[PDB]
Design a protein around this ligand. Structure first.
Ligand SMILES: [Ca+2]
Lengths: 220, 229
């Protein structure tokens, strides 16, 4: 089998700049039969199937911007992206398109670097309809922040919580290169009705000092 | 235009089988190879094999010999992949794709992918709760609202807003597996706080594996401290 090795594993670039990534094959992909290098590049953006970018090492698929350039020969191939755009956020895969079995590289993850952006912080009390079912989920939303690093702490009447919250983070946004984060605190109806203040405490670089969003039970 | 339409997400128990379909349109079905690709997180793309419909010719990744079986019916323009003796390692998104117009020119068209879950756990529809917009989810005139989609199995669920008319500022979070073994996620959206009284906001939640469709109207709430007047 032809082993495809991609490097770097990942990289972080500022929009507008140039990126270069490499794809090596364990055996030559050059057909001495016609002088074509049968190497294919794909872009896979978040939540989407892979998209064909380049084939025969250097030919762009119709519709693909000219700032994507494939180069190389034999066993050493390069994808170059000039003037990188926020929407170029993706994992890029190369593929042996020469001989069976067809094989893929492990991918190069392209991440975007941008100016620091502080999260907008929102808090949601549990719904009346969930409370009826005997459970209370309190949601804290951190919206549109950069960089990814963030700390969210739940406080219930000034007491720090542990083991009763779960956290989810989106992939970088294709337009503004930010992340969003949800933190859900879950307790029983009975345990919820034992307390007054439900607070979400947020630490991030875009914040000079940690931010607290809170409500009193029953207030909303 | 060329289109590949795959069958819906599936749950099957360990040791059983699953069959995924890939319906082709907009081209001559027997002219092009149908490719099958496996994707699990942390394992990039993995080539399973291919078939040229009408010819019976197949090619395998030898690691899938004894696991995957390819067929195609030229009459219905449909390719199939069956996966046998399922294990948790077979849990993944599976794509079909079509070979290129020009020859050895990449997989130019892709199906949307089919999520396969291999688990003993039973199917369960989600509960859908509103995340109401209020002064606690308002900053500088922009208001956050959403729906919490809780306690379902297996993945995936889809969430849309106002039947697809509202896409700006939507964030649908990756599902988290709760300790219970059920999934939970939230879908949120930011909007001007002034439209809260005049615009209706509805999250459309679909969990196809359990045939659950919920349209949840998200109503604004008012906030006030508990005091006597
Ligand atoms: Ca099926």
């Amino acid at each position: 089998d032809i082993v495809m090795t991609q490097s770097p594993s990942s990289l972080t670039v500022t929009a507008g700049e140039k990126v270069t990534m490499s794809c090596k094959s364990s055996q030559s992909l050059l057909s001495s039969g016609n002088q074509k290098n049968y190497l294919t590049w794909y872009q896979q953006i978040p939540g989407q199937p892979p998209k064909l970018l380049i084939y025969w090492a250097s030919t762009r698929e119709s519709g693909v911007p000219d700032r994507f350039t494939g180069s190389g020969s034999g066993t050493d191939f390069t994808l170059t992206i000039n003037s990188v755009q926020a929407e170029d956020l993706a994992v890029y895969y190369c593929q042996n398109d020469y001989t069976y079995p067809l094989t893929f590289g492990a991918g190069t993850k392209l991440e975007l670097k941008r100016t620091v952006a502080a999260p907008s912080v929102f808090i949601f009390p549990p719904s009346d309809e969930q409370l009826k079912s005997g459970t209370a989920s309190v949601v804290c939303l951190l919206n549109n922040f950069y960089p990814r690093e963030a700390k969210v702490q739940w406080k219930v009447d000034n007491a720090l919580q542990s083991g009763n919250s779960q956290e989810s983070v989106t992939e970088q946004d294709s337009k503004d290169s930010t992340y969003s984060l949800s933190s859900t605190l879950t307790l029983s109806k009975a345990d919820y009705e034992k307390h007054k203040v439900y607070a979400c405490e947020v630490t991030h670089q875009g914040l000079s000092s940690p931010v607290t969003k809170s409500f009193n039970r029953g207030e909303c | 235009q060329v289109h590949l339409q795959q069958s819906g997400a599936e749950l099957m128990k360990p040791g059983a089988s699953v069959k995924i379909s890939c319906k082709a349109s907009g081209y001559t079905f027997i002219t092009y190879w149908i490719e099958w690709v496996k994707q699990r997180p942390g394992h990039g793309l993995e080539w399973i094999g291919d078939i040229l419909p009408g010819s019976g010719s197949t090619n395998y990744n030898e690691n899938f010999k004894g696991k995957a079986t390819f067929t195609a019916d030229s009459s219905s323009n449909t390719a199939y992949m069956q996966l046998s003796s399922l294990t948790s390692e077979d849990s993944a998104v599976y794509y079909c794709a079509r070979s290129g117009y020009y020859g050895n020119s990449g997989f130019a068209y892709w199906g949307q992918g089919t999520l396969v879950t291999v688990s003993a756990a039973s199917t369960k529809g989600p509960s859908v709760f509103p995340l109401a917009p209020s002064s606690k989810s308002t900053s500088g005139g922009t208001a956050a609202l959403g729906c919490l989609v809780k306690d379902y199995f297996p993945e995936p669920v889809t969430v849309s807003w106002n039947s697809g008319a509202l896409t700006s500022g939507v964030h649908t979070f990756p599902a988290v597996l709760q300790s219970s073994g059920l999934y939970s996620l939230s879908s949120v959206v930011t909007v001007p706080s002034s439209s809260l009284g005049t615009q209706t906001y509805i999250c459309n939640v679909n969990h196809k594996p359990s045939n659950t469709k919920v349209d949840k109207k998200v109503e604004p709430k008012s906030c006030h401290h508990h005091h006597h007047h």
